[PDB]
Swiss-Prot record, chain B:
Stated name of the protein: Large ribosomal subunit protein uL30A
Protein family membership: Belongs to the universal ribosomal protein uL30 family.
Gene3D superfamilies given in the database record: Ribosomal protein L30, ferredoxin-like fold domain
Membrane-spanning ranges: none
Compartments where found: Cytoplasm
Example of a GO biological process term: maturation of LSU-rRNA from tricistronic rRNA transcript (SSU-rRNA, 5.8S rRNA, LSU-rRNA)
Swiss-Prot record, chain C:
Organism: Saccharomyces cerevisiae (strain ATCC 204508 / S288c)
InterPro entries reported for this sequence: Ribosomal_eL21, Ribosomal_eL21_CS, Ribosomal_eL21_sf, Translation_prot_SH3-like_sf
Protein's GO biological process: cytoplasmic translation
Keyword Transmembrane helix attached: no
Miscellaneous comment as given in the Swiss-Prot or TrEMBL entry: There are 2 genes for eL21 in yeast.
Disulphide bridges, residue numbers: none
Name the UniProt record assigns to this protein: Large ribosomal subunit protein eL21A
Main location (coarse class): cytoplasm
An annotated Gene Ontology molecular function: structural constituent of ribosome
Any Pfam family matching the protein: Ribosomal_L21e
Family: Belongs to the eukaryotic ribosomal protein eL21 family.
Function: Component of the ribosome, a large ribonucleoprotein complex responsible for the synthesis of proteins in the cell. The small ribosomal subunit (SSU) binds messenger RNAs (mRNAs) and translates the encoded message by selecting cognate aminoacyl-transfer RNA (tRNA) molecules. The large subunit (LSU) contains the ribosomal catalytic site termed the peptidyl transferase center (PTC), which catalyzes the formation of peptide bonds, thereby polymerizing the amino acids delivered by tRNAs into a polypeptide chain.
From Swiss-Prot, chain E:
Name under which the protein is recorded: Large ribosomal subunit protein eL18A
Localization: Cytoplasm
Superkingdom per UniProt: Eukaryota
Family assignment from sequence similarity: Belongs to the eukaryotic ribosomal protein eL18 family.
Native species: Saccharomyces cerevisiae (strain ATCC 204508 / S288c) (Baker's yeast)
Length: 172, 222, 159, 58, 185, 51
RNA sequence: AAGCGUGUUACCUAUACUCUACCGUCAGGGUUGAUAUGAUGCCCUGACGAGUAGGCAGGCGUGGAGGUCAGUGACGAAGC
RNA sequence: UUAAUUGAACGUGGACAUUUGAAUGAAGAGCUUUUAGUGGGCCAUUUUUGGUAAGCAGAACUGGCGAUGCGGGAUGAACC
RNA sequence: GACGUAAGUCAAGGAUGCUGGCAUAAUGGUUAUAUGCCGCCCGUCUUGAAACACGGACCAAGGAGUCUAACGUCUAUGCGAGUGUUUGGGUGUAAAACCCAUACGCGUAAUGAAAGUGAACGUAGGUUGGGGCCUCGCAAGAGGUGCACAAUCGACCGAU
RNA sequence: CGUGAAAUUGUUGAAAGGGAAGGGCAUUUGAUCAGACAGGCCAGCAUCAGUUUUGGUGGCA
């Protein structure tokens, strides 16, 4: 997962003589490549419709890119995941510029704060908050205040040498 | 003075004629590869322009590589690995996709990496690591007469005739594929890309169907 | 101690089916068996005479002998590291014709019918069966069939 | 002292080192077990079949 | 490591030479090795393999067995070839005039064949006059009529000969061999 | 006596495959495609950016 | 963090994989009108090589015996 | 055997061939004789019995160790 | 195979060309030591041994599947419906070698408890294969003959 | 009192030695040693062949 990529996977049941042209079901999948993408698609169609990969078909695999990959936007994401003793829904918020990179941050956040692996997480919905004050988290709301400005105290400079002759400072 | 000159010159007269026939087969194979790829590309474009989706034909050929050693293998998958001629680690064969052969691939699934080989990967594989089964011996191809003397009864007269039979799964794929000795690949030159090989490709390991990334993986071994 | 009688461990194997008890219907009494017929074995608990052993339930054999009320069946039994030939005298109640042979004989006629018309025209009639091939290319129209599906649903309890 | 009473462990690896094999069917199987009345008459039918072919072919 | 389907380094299980140290039989092997390699005649390959055979593997061939093979239609003028010993048979009173090639003739067999007007030759005279084995007739003697074969595969209900020193009553004609004494095999 | 590898050793590459000389000269490994500008229907694009 | 969870690469190294050489084994072969005179020889080709109990094969060594080297030796045999 | 060439079984003569009746592989296929050692087992995953349990006692399939070194688990018969 | 119109050349069925130093302890071998990393004591019984299991302080010499009667399989050799000279006899350069009559053993007949009887209807049978050989075919193949062997149905001998 | 082994020991010489010694791969050092001038020893460079590894860069889809 160098980056996540968002794909649409459109699939359908296999046509029969009695019911040709099935319903063409489509999902949006976050995966590292098109193999995991198609795999995750069938995993979720199991949860909804009476179909598996043998009795079904993948009609379209299209990668989706950001309409504007370079504007910082507030993302609201709903995640259903598995804890060690139950299943839990939660809604989080990530400030970033793309859906795929917020999902990258979100999977790092679940695994860091809840020890939930990619195996246990169900991305319910990734929705950009359209206008300010519908952002409900203080760790994102603190980044929307006007004329925001902060320093970076205690700069640590990585030397390329083992021995230095100056007793380096941490100013910035 | 013993008709040596006449049998000398007439052998190259035969050689030029067989070289000319092969040259005009490799020109016709090059055209149909280009014609087929462009027609598929326009198939996706013209279905997109008509509000439809172009469902690609399911792949008719895999290149299966045994990525697991020979110790501690259950009997039924072990017997299938012998029937697919994968007797050691990093060995590879082509398989023609049918529901009969698709069930072999499910049973050897934890032990092999497989997917769909491109023309480029088939060409480099046969040209570099291509060997014939000539009277139970393993003979490097290295010459069109080596292929002609063994597969000529199916029309396969040169190394591209053989490659054409592999990528386009023809009426004589089985005879042309059993003729090829199982490929003895190396370990991948950059590595496997994963810390642990013995998970599925989907889980982040190496085995299973990795449909189109087998081309990148096999070329590192080749 | 241990019990290993003839009809041991046959509690449900030799039971009649639910609401299929009573006298045997006359079709098994009118079936004609011939030497070479392929037959399946399924013991009828109602008929205790002429009755197979529990090993031969579900085994398929070949008729070698035809008797008054009974049939002789060749069956191969895996004993040790090889197969042995077993001759059984089974009454016709525990015998039905094997449907595997009946279906293959249809393809023997159909192959002849396809090959009779072969010499009129069309060499290479493709008489061998083939496995299921991979699907061919097709175009899927969205006319009345626009793709739409939701995401995974959230967790509820339903209790 | 006590010991292991029974195990079929290794008994399939032993049975497969020499290849469990079908009993090699022949043409004309043995007529053992065939009905005596049929076999008694089949002997007399085979005699006249050869006798008819003796006169015809010579 | 290789998942070996078959035993490695397995020998063919066939003789590539006679175990005999006969210097003259080695010349016959040397001549037919050349003949079986520089000709495509199947006869030269069959004879070469038969020259490796052990003593029980080339049973004696009677002149009566030779003569019966000459009652086949068109086989009268063929050269009978026996890779082994031709013995004599007094039970047969007429012998045809034919050419026989053998490794060995007994004195009675050579007398009977010659007295009939025929000829006895060695396998190298056969090679000179029939280099491809044209118009030949390979005859082999009965292998399983050996007394040792009677005891091969001994077991219950198999009807084989027991390995026994003294025969007669009191020697294995009791319990196990008749229903009046226990059981019958 | 020694397996000389094609995909290098151009001489062996020409012993096999006589078309390798035509392919090299005509630059068929870098062939230009034809500029056609068909565009997807409205249904495809609206399905792509659909949530 | 040099801890915990998760992601990406780079890197290290088995008697394992690829290539080559050498040894042996097995298998398939070539080779006689000079086999450039050793056909149990010479040579070509391919694959293979773990091992207790155990089986077989080819060899090394010791005492004595038949043959041979018209063998070695008080100008130094054997032994150490 | 049938009321009866009606059958049953075995046949004579005629027609049919590499897509000859699925896939894959085939390492040569089949057969025989003779004899060695062994007939204390144990461990891992999954199923499973008795038992609170056991580095316990007893079974099923498979893979191992025994019989086996090599790299890793610091170290270890069986784990990777 | 490639190039060259050809001549010929070439990176095309496995390293050649040019130059320098030394010509001996320089390289190499052996051995001692040092250094890096590794290395538990062998033999035995055992599921399991470095074991807090057993034998072993050391060294030399000695030290354990032999021979015989009868026999099974296989192999070599001689002869072959026979075969075995060596119990004996003859002979001798004298325990050797060489030569030999009648017997006898095994084989050439089986079966039954026995008294007894005792092996071709046939091209020593029929059918399915069967190597090799013959005929026709450029060959593939087809037909004929088919030893050994394999399966099966018969015929014959003895017992019942 | 022929020869006169080994265990074990004395002298001399060499070498190493902070709670054993011994051994395997490699090399340094010391000591010791075989062979060869009608090419033996160790190398440098160029152009190739085979197997790889690491870059720079070009044209396409
Ligand atoms: Mg690397
Ligand atoms: Mg019971
Ligand atoms: Mg009763
Ligand atoms: Mg026991
Ligand atoms: Mg970490
Ligand atoms: Mg070994
Ligand atoms: Mg051993
Ligand atoms: Mg001696
Ligand atoms: Mg001396
Ligand atoms: Mg014991
Ligand atoms: Mg043990
Ligand atoms: Mg540990
Ligand atoms: Mg370890
Ligand atoms: Mg595992
Ligand atoms: Mg030194
Ligand atoms: Mg040291
Ligand atoms: Mg250590
Ligand atoms: Mg113990
Ligand atoms: Mg020990
Ligand atoms: Mg003790
Ligand atoms: Mg002691
Ligand atoms: Mg001693
Ligand atoms: Mg003295
Ligand atoms: Mg001393
Ligand atoms: Mg101290
Ligand atoms: Mg180079």
């Amino acid at each position: 997962m160098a980056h996540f990529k968002e794909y649409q996977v459109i699939g359908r049941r296999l046509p029969t003589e009695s019911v040709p042209e099935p319903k063409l079901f489509r999902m949006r999948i976050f995966a590292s490549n098109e193999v995991i993408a198609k795999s995750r698609y069938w995993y979720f169609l199991q949860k909804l419709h009476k179909v598996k990969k043998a009795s079904g078909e993948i009609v379209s695999i299209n990668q989706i890119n950001e309409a504007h990959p370079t504007k910082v936007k507030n993302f609201g994401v709903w995640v259903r995941y598995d804890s060690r003793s139950g299943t839990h829904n939660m809604y989080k918020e990530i400030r970033d510029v793309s859906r795929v990179a917020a999902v990258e941050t979100l999977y790092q956040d679940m695994a860091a704060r809840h020890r939930a692996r990619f195996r246990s997480i169900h991305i319910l919905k990734v929705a950009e908050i359209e206008k300010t004050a519908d952002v409900k988290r203080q760790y994102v709301k603190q980044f929307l205040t006007k004329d925001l400005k902060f320093p970076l105290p205690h700069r640590v400079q990585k030397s390329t040498k083992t021995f230095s002759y100056k007793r380096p400072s941490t100013f910035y | 003075a013993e008709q040596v000159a006449a049998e000398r010159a007439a052998r190259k007269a035969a050689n030029k004629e067989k070289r000319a026939i092969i040259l005009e087969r490799n020109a016709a194979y090059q055209k149909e590869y280009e014609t087929a790829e462009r027609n598929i590309i326009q198939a996706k474009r013209d279905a997109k322009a008509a509000g439809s989706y172009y469902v690609e034909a399911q792949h008719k050929l895999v290149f299966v590589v045994r990525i697991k050693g020979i110790n501690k293998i259950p009997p039924k998958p072990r017997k299938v690995l012998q029937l697919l001629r994968l007797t050691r680690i990093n060995s590879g064969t082509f398989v023609k996709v049918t529901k009969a052969t698709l069930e072999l691939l499910k049973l050897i699934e934890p032990y092999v990496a497989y997917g769909y080989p491109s023309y480029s990967t088939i060409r480099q594989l046969v040209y570099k690591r291509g060997f014939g089964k000539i009277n139970k011996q393993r003979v490097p191809l290295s010459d069109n007469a080596i292929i002609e003397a063994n597969l000529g009864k199916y029309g396969i007269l040169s190394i591209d005739d053989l490659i054409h039979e592999i990528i386009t799964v023809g009426p004589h794929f089985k005879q042309a594929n059993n003729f090829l000795w199982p490929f003895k690949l190396s370990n991948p030159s950059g590595g496997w890309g994963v810390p642990r090989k013995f998970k599925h490709f989907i889980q982040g390991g190496s085995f299973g169907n990795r449909e189109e990334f087998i081309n990148k993986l096999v070329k590192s071994m080749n | 101690g241990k019990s290993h009688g003839y009809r041991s461990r046959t509690r449900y194997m030799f039971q009649r089916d639910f609401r299929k008890h009573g006298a045997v219907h006359l079709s098994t009494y009118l079936k004609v068996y011939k030497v070479g017929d392929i037959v399946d074995i399924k013991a009828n608990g109602s008929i205790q005479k002429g009755m197979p052993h529990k090993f031969y339930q579900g085994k398929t054999g070949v008729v070698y002998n035809v008797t008054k009320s009974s049939v002789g069946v060749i069956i191969n039994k895996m004993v040790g590291n090889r197969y042995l030939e077993k001759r059984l005298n089974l009454r016709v109640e525990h015998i039905k014709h094997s449907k595997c042979r009946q279906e293959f004989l249809e393809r023997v006629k159909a192959n002849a019918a396809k090959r009779a018309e072969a010499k009129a025209q069309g060499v290479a009639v493709q008489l061998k069966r083939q496995p299921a091939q991979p699907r061919e290319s097709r175009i899927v129209s969205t006319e009345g069939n626009v793709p739409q599906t939701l995401a995974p649903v959230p967790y509820e309890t339903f209790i | 002292a006590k010991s292991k009473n029974h195990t079929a462990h290794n008994q399939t690896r032993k049975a497969h080192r020499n290849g469990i094999k079908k009993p090699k069917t022949y043409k004309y199987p043995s007529l053992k077990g065939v009905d005596p009345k049929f076999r008694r008459n089949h002997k007399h039918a085979l005699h006249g079949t050869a006798k008819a072919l003796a006169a015809a072919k010579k | 490591g290789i998942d070996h389907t078959s035993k490695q380094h397995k020998r063919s299980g066939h003789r590539t030479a006679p175990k005999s140290d006969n210097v003259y039989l080695k010349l016959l092997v040397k001549l037919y090795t050349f003949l079986a390699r520089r000709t495509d005649a199947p006869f030269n390959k069959v004879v070469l393999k038969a020259l490796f055979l052990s003593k029980i593997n080339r049973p004696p061939v009677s002149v009566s067995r030779i003569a019966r093979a000459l009652k086949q239609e068109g086989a009268a003028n063929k050269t009978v070839v026996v890779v082994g010993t031709v013995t004599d048979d007094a039970r047969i009173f007429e012998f045809p005039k034919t050419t026989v090639a053998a490794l060995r003739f007994t004195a009675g067999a050579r007398a009977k064949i010659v007295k009939a007007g025929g000829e006895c030759i060695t396998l190298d005279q056969l090679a000179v006059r029939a280099p491809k084995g044209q118009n030949t007739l390979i005859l082999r003697g009965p292998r399983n009529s050996r007394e040792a074969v009677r005891h091969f595969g001994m077991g219950p209900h198999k009807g084989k000969a027991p390995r026994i020193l003294s025969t007669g009553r009191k020697f294995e004609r009791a319990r196990g061999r008749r229903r009046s004494k226990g059981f019958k095999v | 006596v020694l397996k000389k590898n094609p995909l290098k050793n151009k001489q062996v590459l020409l012993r096999l495959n006589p078309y390798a000389k035509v392919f090299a000269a005509e630059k068929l490994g870098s062939k230009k495609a034809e500029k056609t500008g068909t565009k997807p229907a409205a249904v495809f694009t609206e399905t792509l950016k659909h949530d």
